[PDB]
Amino acid sequence: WWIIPKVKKGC
Amino acid sequence: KKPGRVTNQLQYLHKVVMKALWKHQFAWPFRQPVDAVKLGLPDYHKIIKQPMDMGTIKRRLENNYYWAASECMQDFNTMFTNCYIYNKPTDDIVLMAQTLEKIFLQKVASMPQEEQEL
Ligand SMILES: [Zn+2]
Ligand SMILES: [Zn+2]
């Protein structure tokens, strides 16, 4: 999943 | 519709290449078309005129949409290239795309070089 879309994922 | 057929290279891209990438850990952002509205991606579809994803490639392989393996190869390279064009080089999505393309090239390197219709 995305913390910040495309920039930083969570998983 | 458009002419479609089954070839040894298309079967390889399906049963070997697509199989390796569809289950990959970095595959989840690529299994469906990019939803730039839901993700809040400005100017995505103004910049990306030919969106492509593994989900579309998978359905095309499973429905004999392609005439030759080079058409499927173009779709894979469109998907990767679109990611590198829109996103910044150090974004997480680009690193995931580069990892998937690494496995892509490794499996495609072993593809039968002569394409024959089956
Ligand atoms: Zn859009
Ligand atoms: Zn399949």
Author numbering:
A (entry chain E): 1 to 11
B (entry chain A): 70 to 187
Copy text from the publication.
Despite heavy academic and industry investment in this area, the generation of paralog-selective inhibitors has proved elusive because of the extremely high sequence similarity between the bromodomains of family members (90 to 95% within the acetyllysine-binding pocket residues). Using the highly conserved BET BDs as a model system, we conducted three mRNA display-based RaPID (random nonstandard peptides integrated discovery) screens using a single library (which contains >1012 unique members).
Among BD1 domains, peptides 3.1B and 3.1C displayed little selectivity, with affinities of each peptide for BRD2-BD1 and BRD4-BD1 within a factor of 2 to 4 of their affinity for BRD3-BD1, the domain against which they were selected. All of the residues in all three structures that contact 3.1C are completely conserved, consistent with the very similar affinities observed by SPR.
